[PDB]
Design a protein around this ligand. Structure first.
Ligand SMILES: O=C(O)c1cc(C(=O)O)c(C(=O)N(Cc2cccc(Oc3ccccc3)c2)[C@H]2CCCc3ccccc32)cc1C(=O)O
Ligand SMILES: O=C(O)c1cc(C(=O)O)c(C(=O)N(Cc2cccc(Oc3ccccc3)c2)[C@H]2CCCc3ccccc32)cc1C(=O)O
Ligand SMILES: O=C(O)c1cc(C(=O)O)c(C(=O)N(Cc2cccc(Oc3ccccc3)c2)[C@H]2CCCc3ccccc32)cc1C(=O)O
Ligand SMILES: *[C@@H]1O[C@H](CO)[C@@H](O)[C@H](O)[C@H]1NC(C)=O
Ligand SMILES: *[C@@H]1O[C@H](CO)[C@@H](O)[C@H](O)[C@H]1NC(C)=O
Ligand SMILES: *[C@@H]1O[C@H](CO)[C@@H](O)[C@H](O)[C@H]1NC(C)=O
Ligand SMILES: *[C@@H]1O[C@H](CO)[C@@H](O)[C@H](O)[C@H]1NC(C)=O
Ligand SMILES: *[C@@H]1O[C@H](CO)[C@@H](O)[C@H](O)[C@H]1NC(C)=O
Ligand SMILES: *[C@@H]1O[C@H](CO)[C@@H](O)[C@H](O)[C@H]1NC(C)=O
Ligand SMILES: [Mg+2]
Ligand SMILES: [Mg+2]
Ligand SMILES: [Mg+2]
Ligand code: NA
Lengths: 327, 327, 327
């Protein structure tokens, strides 16, 4: 009967349409390179006020070279003119009643204990230690540099898909409005401007600059390069996203934020050495460049072809059995 | 007829040969690991002359630890003995006629304006600012360290393909001529020497050391590990390429080169603080290690097998139809 | 005969079982993301004694920001109060007999030779050089900071599989015993504690802290994220491994270890500049985060399906031919 081939022909048409759209949707004919090779060069701009001092890029940005991970210092704690010697630790955890509890068995991983129980103040008695004196007092409250909200981060990103030798950059004057220096990045109004406002980045990550500057934190400027190298060279475009990386988990057991210690080493006219100990709180920025490209290839196209051919050939039989049975 | 099977047998032989060479060429029987895990340790060697001073590795290399990204400083601008205070900015962009145009609305992202219009010199009148005084003069011309062309970069690279747990290194004494310390890297005469001459790297990237040292730049020493783990362990070999990463695009809108600012912080005998502000131009080197290995696997070999089997089975039918029709 | 279909049915059952277990074992139905996107934040804790000085985290850890690569300085060589000038190099390789062998042709890549042959001591005569004087004496023996064995490394690692947008962290209070701060990492007793003991890390890598601290070295804290995103979110877990990265190859031709030079720059009350030159030996730690996830996908499941269908269909024929023939 002719209808039998009109039922099968319709069967093959329809079933082949489902399979066809599926394989075409997932780019099953494409080999994929997911090992992007990126270089990131950053430039921070701005000036702030801390105490009665003025901070410029040389004072609060560390490191200076413009790497993919850098820190904008917003708050710090200074302990000036330290010098090697003996002094009572100011940490309460080092409280003692007699020299019998200031032995090596106590706080093994901590500082160097001299073995004497001394009076830091009239209200506390702590183990004496050898090291930089006086000791640090990290329980005080200090101001935060608010101007850092208006600082700008300029990100130059140069990536390359090696499997295809397809290299491109994120400096695109055509995609962003002229006076490029004057652009700033908005996810909607200017999603291709390489200049990021610090406060903006803090907002895009859903973070309060006050609490963040107070406790410090780690933010990530994410550059994504999902590209179809079958389309125009013009179509491979970077997409920026933002996130806070220092988990604020309720379970915690650890204080949130981000801070680190460094000293400025001075030597005396008399030749003795003394440093300024600095506890720095700021916003570390990690530029994380992900990307994967897909290019047509003969091998994946043949495998997907055979897959769809055989799969349809079975689906038509199964559909014929389902029909003849009628249920 | 016997010829019918001699035509089909020849058909199957030939068609199967096309498919066979294609799948065998693309290593369709191989699973691929494109997530190389590399460690890079670098060592720079050399000494230069700048002004009437001698620069050693401790003076021009930053950072010192020998990471995958480092900078060889070739030119710098010094502003010595700065101290917090008030002074007229030297940038022309800060020109003013009266204190009415030195308000917060002007240059919001710039320095801290005091609000006074002062006379930097007799020919210019600029807004006064609070910060490190005197201000920087980044419009002067300074020499460049030419000896940096003869510096050598030693790159230790240790990579690992985790999917196969196949780890190897780029220090290969057998592939490079003895007196290894005396080797230097030429793409043809010594393509496995880990010692790179700075000037050589500048040449391999097609760059002029004069202009590059003058304006600074970003070069990439690329280590590629394309390997067939089906062949001998001896065959997985690294291949070095070179490129300049700071786009010099005509569209530009940004000054090419690479520079960053850092200060040397001194404290006075009287206790006041003062720094030396340094604008550094140099050549940043980014070691970019790409790699992908292919090892025989049962799953990809079966999928490719089925693919070629079915594909030939259809190609022979299509070729039979093309022949019987004769066109 | 009915037995013919009982032989074929058993044939299809058995053969289909081999193929089925194979494809199910290799997760052939899974698409794989091998481009993990990780952020690493490290914190070192401890204090040591070197000479009659006390070293804290600000003195021996470099860089300070807590990156994925950092160095714990264990031994160092100090050359104090250097100043630009002329002096005889102390390296024996610079031995001379007359000013005729101190020309530019000698040691082209080395220091700046003045051209004079001078007497460093009564037993050696070396070329004079311009640079930081006095010169460094890197042939002396210095102590090593032993307390560094008891230091602790705290590693915060935040990764993300972008293909699935599946992000997770390595701070897992449920997997590690409470008093999290008090945990320390043992591969068996506490394989999820983020706090690493320096000495432990040195042991897990099969290295002697004595020789390592003496010569310096490069260790890698490896975080592996092999995950089946088909299983519970709870099952994607990090696994830590350890390795020494500075090859100690017998062929060598290079001194093992790891060291770098940096200076502390001082300026004189009289205004002249002088530095302290420091050769630092320590243990560099490189946090290397690998990972690959597998999630069920329609495309790979269909391709593997067709593969097994066709492959079984041929295996049954081949097995029938092998049986009928009987050999
Ligand atoms: O100044 C301080 O007093 C200070 C206090 C702390 C603290 O939290 O107690 C810290 C700190 O963050 N850690 C890390 C830490 C904290 C809590 C829990 C931790 O373990 C887990 C958390 C969650 C999930 C799984 C495990 C890890 C310390 C704790 C112990 C060991 C140790 C070693 C090295 C470095 C730091 C720290 C740092 C400092 C400092 O700057 O010197
Ligand atoms: O010392 C200086 O005077 C100085 C000048 C410039 C400058 O080019 O104008 C710069 C500089 O490079 N940028 C970056 C920049 C420049 C031009 C165009 C830009 O945008 C695009 C370019 C091409 C394609 C798409 C976008 C981005 C500045 C410009 C604005 C904002 C801003 C913020 C942070 C950092 C730097 C800069 C730096 C400095 C400095 O060292 O302090
Ligand atoms: O203080 C020193 O005197 C000193 C000595 C050496 C040394 O080994 O001779 C070194 C050093 O490690 N290298 C690297 C090096 C050594 C041996 C063989 C090498 O080549 C291969 C090894 C194995 C396989 C394939 C190649 C590479 C030097 C050697 C030459 C060039 C050069 C350039 C830059 C930097 C360092 C070095 C450093 C210093 C220093 O800190 O200043
Ligand atoms: C580490 O600390 C323990 C005390 O917990 C001490 O017994 C041991 O000697 C220390 N290790 C070193 C190398 O000093
Ligand atoms: C250097 O002077 C300071 C105070 O000015 C003094 O405390 C110190 O002991 C002196 N140095 C030495 C080595 O005595
Ligand atoms: C940022 O600059 C604008 C002027 O453009 C100013 O109104 C605003 O107060 C500044 N932000 C902060 C936090 O000072
Ligand atoms: C320290 O001395 C300098 C000049 O020698 C002087 O300008 C400065 O005001 C002094 N410090 C203080 C706090 O006055
Ligand atoms: C590099 O060294 C050679 C001697 O080997 C010398 O002739 C040449 O001038 C040096 N290059 C520069 C730029 O000084
Ligand atoms: C500064 O003083 C030192 C010794 O105190 C002296 O050697 C040096 O020459 C002086 N500076 C200048 C520029 O003369
Ligand atoms: Mg403390
Ligand atoms: Mg300026
Ligand atoms: Mg030497
Ligand atoms: Na297939």
């Amino acid at each position: 009967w002719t209808i039998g081939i009109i039922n099968r022909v319709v069967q093959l048409l329809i079933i082949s349409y489902f399979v066809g759209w599926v394989f075409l949707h997932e780019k099953a004919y494409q080999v994929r390179d997911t090992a992007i090779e990126s270089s990131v060069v950053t430039k921070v701009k701005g000036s702030g006020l801390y105490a009665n001092r003025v901070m410029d890029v040389s004072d609060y940005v560390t490191p200076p070279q413009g790497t993919s991970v850098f820190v904008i210092i917003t708050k710090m704690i200074v302990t000036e003119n330290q010098m090697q010697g003996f002094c009572p630790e100011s940490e309460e955890k080092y409280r003692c009643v007699s020299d019998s509890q200031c032995g090596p068995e106590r706080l093994p991983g901590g500082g160097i204990l001299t073995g004497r129980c001394v009076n830091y103040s009239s209200v506390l008695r702590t183990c004496e230690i050898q090291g930089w004196c006086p000791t640090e007092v990290d329980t005080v409250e200090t101001p935060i540099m608010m101007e850092a909200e208006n600082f700008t981060i300029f990100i130059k990103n140069s990536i390359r898909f090696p499997l295809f030798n397809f290299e491109k950059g994120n400096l695109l004057p055509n995609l962003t409005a002229r006076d490029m220096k004057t652009c700033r990045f908005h996810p909607d109004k200017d999603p291709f401007c390489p200049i990021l406002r610090v406060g903006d980045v803090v907002k895009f990550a859903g973070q309060d600059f006050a609490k963040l500057a107070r406790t410090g934190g780690v933010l990530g400027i994410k550059i994504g390069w999902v590209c179809d190298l079958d389309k125009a060279w013009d179509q491979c475009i970077p997409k920026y996203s933002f996130t806070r990386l220092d988990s604020v988990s309720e379970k915690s057991s650890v204080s949130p934020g981000y801070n680190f210690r460094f000293a400025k080493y001075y030597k005396m006219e008399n030749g003795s050495e003394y440093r300024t100990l600095l506890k720095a709180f700021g916003i570390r920025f990690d530029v994380l460049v992900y990307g994967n490209a897909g290019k047509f290839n003969i091998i994946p196209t043949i495998i997907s072809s055979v897959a769809a051919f055989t799969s349809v050939g079975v689906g038509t039989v199964l559909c014929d059995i389902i029909l003849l049975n009628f249920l």
